[PDB]
Write a protein that binds this ligand. Structure first.
Ligand SMILES: NC(=O)c1ccc[n+]([C@@H]2O[C@H](COP(=O)([O-])OP(=O)(O)OC[C@H]3O[C@@H](n4cnc5c(N)ncnc54)[C@H](OP(=O)(O)O)[C@@H]3O)[C@@H](O)[C@H]2O)c1
Length: 342
């Protein structure tokens, strides 16, 4: 009854671990270095948490050692290890190759040393593998759990955005491809999770550094921005609270009803200005120390870009997602409070 979570130092994966432990599960995280396999254990301070070193997921057979060792004992797997880099220079090396090869390694590992044992896999695909990047501002497009990013190998490296989305997309295709080809040879049942822009507070207060993980850095940067910086008030994308994501991943391997599902996690359209208004609304005493409040935003006009039909998702999961106002507030409070401003 053990749970392997890959990429366990991750913003999201650290909430997943929190939840796994809350429910008294034996967790095996994977991390890049020993440096980090130490930092985490001290934070969690839990006898059920163990770690295995996987420095590079793209490398040959990257997960085979974990399954020689802990082979008999891993029943559920949460593959959450994929690169997230918005400034990546080597697009194939930095994004696509690890996304794909990391996933083939994880899966081919489960084929080789634990075909019969591993009951469930929960993969962290993305809103990126469902949306059409360049058509986010097109309200005639509706996205649901059967929608795919039509990006092809040939036009995927247009820029860094189209690259990291393609990476999530192609990795996913490989997963499903795998499942269909080997459904007779391996027992596990795949479930993929598709979060949009994940915001929310860092699982540990100490992890509030000068520069956060990629998506929360959006908020962090804005909060420390000089007063008269230009803030984009046009619609940007969808969000979903990290806490909602965590819960969802664990449910992923628990509930029978979530087998073979693509779970689409959005809960609100937002702009940069819409985030900045939460600064000014919830912490009025700090007016002047970040950009100002402006209501005329695409959100308040009623402009939300493309439509999200995630009703099947919401029904299946059962729980209510966290409102934007809460998610931004909690993210912000944690930082300002760590800094001693409130
Ligand atoms: N952030 C979001 O809003 C968002 C939205 C949709 C989906 N996701 C997905 O959620 C998962 C976690 O993302 P995150 O937002 O938590 O970012 P994150 O903090 O970078 O989490 C990713 C973790 O995986 C590790 N990692 C990356 N590449 C690796 C490699 N080649 N080998 C071994 N470990 C590697 C990272 O370690 P290093 O930092 O040491 O590289 C990090 O600890 C990813 O699968 C991502 O695609 C995230």
């Amino acid at each position: 009854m053990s749970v392997l979570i890959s990429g366990a130092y991750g913003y999201i994966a650290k909430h997943i671990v929190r939840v796994l432990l809350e429910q008294n599960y034996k967790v095996i995280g994977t991390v890049r270095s020993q440096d980090k396999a130490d930092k985490l254990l001290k934070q969690y301070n839990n006898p059920n948490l163990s770690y295995e070193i996987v420095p590079e997921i793209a490398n040959l057979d990257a997960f085979d050692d974990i399954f020689k060792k802990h082979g008999k004992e891993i029943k559920y797997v949460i593959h959450a290890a994929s690169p997230v880099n918005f400034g990546a220079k080597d697009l194939e090396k930095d994004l696509v190759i690890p996304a794909i090869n990391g996933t083939k390694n994880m899966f081919e590992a489960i084929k080789k040393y634990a075909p019969d044992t591993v009951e469930r896999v929960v993969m962290t695909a993305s809103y990126a593998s469902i949306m059409t990047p360049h058509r986010q501002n097109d309200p005639t497009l509706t996205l649901d759990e059967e929608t795919w990013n039509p990006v092809t190998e040939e036009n995927a490296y247009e820029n860094v955005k189209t690259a990291y989305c393609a990476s999530k997309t192609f990795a996913e295709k490989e997963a499903w491809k795998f499942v269909k080809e080997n459904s007779d040879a391996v027992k596990f049942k795949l479930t993929t999770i598709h979060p949009s822009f994940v915001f929310g507070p860092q699982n540990f207060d100490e992890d509030v550094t000068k520069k956060l993980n990629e998506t929360c850095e959006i908020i962090n940067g804005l909060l420390h921005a000089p007063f008269d910086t230009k803030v984009e008030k046009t619609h940007f994308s969808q969000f979903i609270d990290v806490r909602d994501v965590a819960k969802t991943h664990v449910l992923g391997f628990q509930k029978d009803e979530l087998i073979n599902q693509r779970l689409l996690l959005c809960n609100g359209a937002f702009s940069q200005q819409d985030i900045v208004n939460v600064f000014n609304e919830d912490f009025p005493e700090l007016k002047g120390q970040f950009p100002p409040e402006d209501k005329d935003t695409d959100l308040n006009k009623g402009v939300t870009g493309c439509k999200i039909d995630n009703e099947k998702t919401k029904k299946l999961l059962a729980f209510e997602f966290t409102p934007f106002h809460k998610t931004i507030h909690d993210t912000v409070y944690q930082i300002l409070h760590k800094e001693g401003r409130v």
